[PDB]
Structures are given as C-alpha cells and as structure tokens.
Amino acid sequence: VVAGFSDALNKGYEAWGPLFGKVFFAFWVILHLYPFLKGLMGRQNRTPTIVVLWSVLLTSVFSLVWVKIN
Amino acid sequence: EPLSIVYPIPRNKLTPYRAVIIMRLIILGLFFHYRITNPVDSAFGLWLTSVICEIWFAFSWVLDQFPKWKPVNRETFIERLSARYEREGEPSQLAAVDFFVSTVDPLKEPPLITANTVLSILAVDYPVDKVSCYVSDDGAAMLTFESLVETAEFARKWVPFCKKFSIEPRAPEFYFSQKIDYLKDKVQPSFVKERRAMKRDYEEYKVRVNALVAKAQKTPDEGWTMQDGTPWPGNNTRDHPGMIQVFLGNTGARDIEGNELPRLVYVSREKRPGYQHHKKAGAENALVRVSAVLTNAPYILNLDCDHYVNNSKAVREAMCILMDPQVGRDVCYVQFPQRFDGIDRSDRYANRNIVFFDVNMKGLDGIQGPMYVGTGCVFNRQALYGYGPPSMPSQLSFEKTFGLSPVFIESTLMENGGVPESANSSTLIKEAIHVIGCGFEEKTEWGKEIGWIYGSVTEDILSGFKMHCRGWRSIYCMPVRPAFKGSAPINLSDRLHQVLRWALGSVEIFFSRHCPFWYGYGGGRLKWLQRLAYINTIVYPFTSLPLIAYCTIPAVCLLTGKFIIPTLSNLASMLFLGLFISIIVTAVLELRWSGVSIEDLWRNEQFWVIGGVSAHLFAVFQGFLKMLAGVKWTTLLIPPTTLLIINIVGVVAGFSDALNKGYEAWGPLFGKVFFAFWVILHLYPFLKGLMGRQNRTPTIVVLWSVLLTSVFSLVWVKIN
Amino acid sequence: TVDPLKEPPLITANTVLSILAVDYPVDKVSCYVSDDGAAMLTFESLVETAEFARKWVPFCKKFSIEPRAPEFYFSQKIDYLKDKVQPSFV
Lengths: 70, 720, 90
Ligand SMILES: OC[C@H]1O[C@@H](O[C@H]2[C@H](O)[C@@H](O)[C@H](O[C@H]3[C@H](O)[C@@H](O)[C@H](O[C@H]4[C@H](O)[C@@H](O)[C@H](O[C@H]5[C@H](O)[C@@H](O)[C@H](O)O[C@@H]5CO)O[C@@H]4CO)O[C@@H]3CO)O[C@@H]2CO)[C@H](O)[C@@H](O)[C@@H]1O
Description:
part of a larger assembly; 3 chains; mainly alpha; 3 helices; about 75% helix; flat; binds a molecule of 5 linked components (BGC-BGC-BGC-BGC-BGC); Cellulose synthase (chain A)
C-alpha cells in the first residue's frame, strides 16, 4: 500500500478514482489484522506504542526519499 | 566449586551490536566530514552553530556508548554457599555484617517507615550472632528514640513468626498492605490463626506509634523528659552530647521462644556550635568508627530509610559473591539494583529509570563494575578504610591517618574482625562514646582520603571513583527478586529537585580536585574504558548547553533563515537515510538483549531531553557561578515553557508564511517542520501533566483554543 | 420520607444515625422524622435504629470518627488507622 501509494503520487492525479478503491480493500484487511498482531508483540492494548509511529513516519520518509531519488 | 558464575552475552546478540555500532560510527564520521567540507548553506553563523552543536552531540554519544561495550551477566548459588560454608554439625563460618540506617528528622518523614525498615533489617535470614543493625540520627529527636523503643518490642513479637513461616516481604506495613493472595504456597497447619493474631498485634503497635508521633508534636517549655525521669540530652539540636544505646542484644531482651535477636545500636553524634558537620558523610563515617569499636564486622551494608529489604536473601547472596577466594578477593562492594514500588500504569514521570540500571549498569559491570549510588551496597571494611586490594595489584602514621584513639587503631589492625579484648562491654561503650566525639576529625585523613569523600552535595559517586582508582573492583548482582525495594517520590517538584541536585553534584565534582580528566593518573590501576565511563558520568550535564541551542535552532530556521541544508540526491540524502536507519536499528538491537520495553527507551530519552532543557542548564549555570565565587519549580520550568511557546508560535507563523507562498516550499517546509515537531512532541507531554489535572485526557478546551488561535493567525495573515 | 419501597429504609436509618451522632450538646440537638406513606416498615426500621444508635453513639463520640454514617463509613478504602491514638481502638 505504501509503495503503490507513492507510485500513485508520481502520476499526474490520474489515480483520483482507482487509488481509493484499491487502498480501501487493503485498509479493510489491515484494520482487521493489525489490532491482533499489536497485542501479542505489544506489552499493552491501551497504548500500542509511540516509537512505532516514529519509525513508520521515518519509514514513510525512507520510501518517499528513495522514490524522489530513483 | 564455583559459588557464583559470570557468563557474558551468548554472542548471538553481542557481535551484531558491535558491528552495528561500528557501522553507525563510520557513518557519523563520513557524515561529519562531508558536512564540514562540501556544504556552506549560504549562511555562516546559523550553519556554524548547527555543525558545532552536532559535533558536540557526536562526541557525547561516542563517549557515552562505548561503556556499554561487552555486557556481562552473573548468577549466584545460595545452595552451594550453604552446603560449603554453613558446615552443618559444626559452628558456622559466615562473616559478620553491619547494616547501617541513617535518619535526618522525624517530622519530614514519619518514623513508621524507619521502624518498618528497621524491622526488615532485624528479620533477615542470617545467623543472629553475625548480623548487627545500627541506626543513626542527626536531629537527636526523642520521637525517634521512643519509636525505636516500641519497635524493639514489636520486633521481639514479630521475628519468630516471620522466621518460622518464611514470609516475605519482611516489612510489616508493606507486607500486610498486599492484595496478592497471602495463602498461596503455605503448608504450615496453624498459619491462619498466627497470621490473624500477628495482624492484630501489628495494628495495636501502629496505634501506639501513631500516639507517640501525635504526642511528639507538642514541645513542653521545660524540655523533653524520659520515662525514667531524666532530661533528654538532645534538647538543643545544635548543642548536645552524643549518646549510644543498645537494644535487642545479648545483654538486652530476648525472643518469646528464648532465642536471641540481632543487636540494634542507636547512635547520635555530638554536635556543638561553631563546629562544621557534614550532612551525611559525617554520619556514616561516625557509624563506621563506632561499629569498628563495638562490633568489628568486615562487611558494612549501607541503606536508607525509604528502602527496605524485600527478600531475606540479599545478605546471603552478598556473602556468596564476597566469599570466593577467586572472585571474592578483589571485590570491594556489591551494588544492588534499587527498584521502586507504587507505580501507576502511566509512568509519565519516568521515576523508574531502569534503562540506566539494566542496559548501562550491566554493560559497565564487565570492565570494572558499577558505581556507588547511595543504597544497597556491601562495602568491605578494609576497602572503606583504604588499603588497596590484597596481594596488589608506623604507629605515629597510623595515629595521623586514622585518629587519636588507639582502641580504634588496634581494632582496625585486625583483618578477620571481631573484638579482641572480648571483655568490659561498658568500657567499650565509653570508648565508643569517646570515638564519636565532635573533635575526632580535625587533622586526620577521615573523609579527605579514607572514608566518605567529603563533598558539598554529592559524594557517593566520588567515594566509589576514589576507591576504584586504588585498584579495587566492584560487582553488580541482580537477583530474581529486587531484594531492595523502597518508596519513590510521587510528585514532580521532588523529582526535579533531585535531578537538579544530581547535576549540581556532578558539576561540583568536575570542577573540584577529583576531576577524572587529570586525576588518578599515577600508577594506573584504572581501566581506560572505566575512566571514559567516569568522564561520561561526570560531564553529562554539559551537553545541556549545546542541547538548548540545538533545540532552539529550528524555531529560528523556520522563521528567519527559512532553510536547513541543500539536499543532494546522490550522497546527502543517502547519508541522512543511513544515519536515520542506523540509529533505530541500533536501538532495537540493543533493546533485544536487555529485555527492556520499547516505550521505556523513548520515555527515558524524552525525560533526559527535558532535564537537559531545564535541570542540567540551571545546574551548570549555578556551577559556573559557584566556581567563579570560589530554586523553585516554577522558576525551573521557565526554560521549558519559553521553548515550547517560541517553537509553537514559530512553527505556526512559518506554516502560514509558507502557505501564502505559491507552493514553492513543498520540500523545505516539511524539512523545517519535522525538527520542530520532534522537539514539540518530546517537550509537550511533560508540560501537559504538570499544567493538566490528568494524563489520560489532557483537555478538550485547549484544542478549541488552539484551533481558534490558528484561525486568528490565518485571518491576521489574510488581512495584513 | 415519602415511601420505603422507592428508596430502601437503610439509607434513611444511616441519615438518622448521622443526625443523632453530631458534635453538639445532647440537650440542644433534636431530630424529627416525618413520613407521608405512613408505612410500618419505616417505623420498625426507626425502632431498630434507636437501639443501634444507643450502641453506636458512645463509640463514635469517644473516638471522633468521621463520617458518622456507618454504611458510608465502614465502606471506605482510606486507611482507617491514620491518626488514631486511642490504645483500645482496634
Ligand atoms: O539512577 C540514579 C543515579 O543517576 C546518576 O545520574 C545518571 C542518571 O541516573 C542517568 O539517567 C543518566 O543517563 C543519561 C545520560 O546521563 C545521558 O548522557 C544520556 O544521553 C544520551 C541519550 O540517552 C540518548 O538518547 C542520545 O541518543 C541520541 C544521540 O545522542 C544522537 O546523536 C541522535 O541523533 O539521537 C539519539 C536519540 O534518538 O545520546 C545521549 C548521549 O549523547 O541519556 C541517559 C539516559 O537515557 O546519566 C546520569 C549520570 O551519567 C547519578 O549520578 C547518581 O548519583 C544516581 O545514583
């Protein structure tokens, strides 16, 4: 989703329709699956963490920077 | 047989750590070389400040991360200790232990906690003839004396029950106030009735102690009077003779079953007007001297009022560590991890601070051992006096170095310990009273180079460093149970004052004669890595001076400069990515082998940033002022509040100014805003709690105000 | 009181005990209880509360405990042995 998400940005706004449909199905699968995987690998369900958010946004910059450079 | 074994990391988590940290160092070096050479950034002062602060951070990090190299683990074997040294069927051959407890004043902290810790000390699993407890007070208050008198009877009642049913923790308050199932693995048929009766007795004792505390608040004009009908010697705090008393000893009371109980010695020093007395260095040193006279124990276990003994095995584990001819000869003290209790789920205060106690302390254990912290340490008596490691690496001289008293010199001349005369106990009490005289430490080397290193504020780390410079080695033992649990501060003012005190003590040590940069350089006997770790621990507050400037940088860069650094696809961005991924992978891999929760590292680093922002800054400025010569929490919060407001106003104003532009900031705006967001996210959670009534939900009104203020800024920009 | 079924008489009895256990001279304070339902349950509850107050008033007035309501006092998780100095309190 993140890789294709960036690949849609490079296009000239031609994915305004297709991107949401493809992303929505991925979001449905992830939203169902993610909460379970968080708890077993996480110490509490009240607050998953704040570091993973930092890593995710930094990882978002990672893919974005690479796409701009390659 | 080996009573304790010390095994390093299994090497499945250590070589990858070493490789990743070396890669990080190489990447940092390449980054700094490229930054120094190629870019100019079109501005000299801003770029110079950024690069110099980054270089200072790099030096700090490289000098702080190396001590973590070569982590080491350890475990002890009480079963084999008992099998060999206990020698069932023949007299025991276990060394004596002298527990120390020091109190300042009963009003600031209730005497109930002191009584609880005294009971926990008196209810350890060790032969009664060996363990001996000592309690010292600086206030010389009769409330503490009466509390100890009542605690003597309560201990007489409580010790047989605890030692017979092997209950834990030994502290009565902290044990009865437990919601864990008390009937879990107890097989004694008559446990329930005994527990109920002992609980009722403990409640009665609590009532009596509360009555004494309430009575103590009223001061008669004639002064305090004892039950026997004698004026209290400690009427005037400034001027009063020193007094020594004995309880629950072989001479005193005995247990209900007839067995004896460990002796408890209550010592109050002699203080006079015009005489300089140290806060705690002069109390523990006097305790060491008076113990050397009364019961010469080779091992002295130091503690505090708040901290009590959790499990009745810490003494046995210390004996296991210190008794081995191989791994017990060069050992000087066995530092224990001081764990705290009464922690909520949201530990926003980060008072736990176990990343230091586990990731860093164990890492340092490999080279030369941990540092004295001020609680839970079994010092070697000879090491405390100062002799150097055995098998390294005149009478007038002995008088000069130790003191004028000849009895103390004769007692300390014995390596094994004990009392050689073994007679005339009353004369020994008189000799102890003489030894605790105010003028004993006038021109001797007490404290200066022998005992607790005299210091204005902080001396534990100084004493540990001084005694390590002589070639000694220390151990770090982590039992499955904490074995030393104590109450922790729960508010923010106390925590801020404590961190400020630590920073001030570190700065004072740095500016004093005992400076690692140019101290302990004769004869070696100090590992280079250990000296590097000491330098890290001493000059850590100085990083606040560049940290404040660095965290201020983004606010100005986003408003006036409007630039950070030109971006080059080939090399600059690649180096940025390398650093960013290397730091996170290093953190994860380090956490892998230490069993630390991921959120704990983030919480600790944000707390460290806060302390650098305010506590370390004020401490270092006060250090400069004191060195040149020769605070409220509200004032302490001024720098954090100022930085938060300046950063938020700058980021919002620059966001509006970039929006007014024709989409020409698509890269630079994100680049400039990321650093500000990082700083604000590290800083805001702390300020919210102190200015908020709860951490669960900050508020909803502040969100309304923030959106309305954003509308205000937008409207003002549109209209002007 | 309006009716004992809508609200249990236990709360009314607790309030009556709290009223009867105030710190004021016994000759001055006087309590009055009125009912609109005229139910015998309230009368019997008050009759029993009279004996319970006879038992409870000296203890409360001697040990200066608070709050005076027994239902709302015994059901408190705050440390009940906080600042009590009476030797035979337990
Ligand atoms: O516990 C009681 C005991 O405390 C003693 O004082 C201790 C204190 O207890 C410790 O908490 C403290 O530990 C901190 C270090 O002092 C401090 O130097 C260190 O700073 C680190 C920081 O933790 C780390 O996050 C940071 O990483 C950054 C890199 O530096 C950057 O290059 C990169 O860009 O970003 C990362 C962050 O993402 O590096 C710095 C070092 O450069 O943080 C420690 C806490 O985590 O040390 C004190 C003494 O040294 C006290 O003396 C005793 O009396 C007392 O008993």
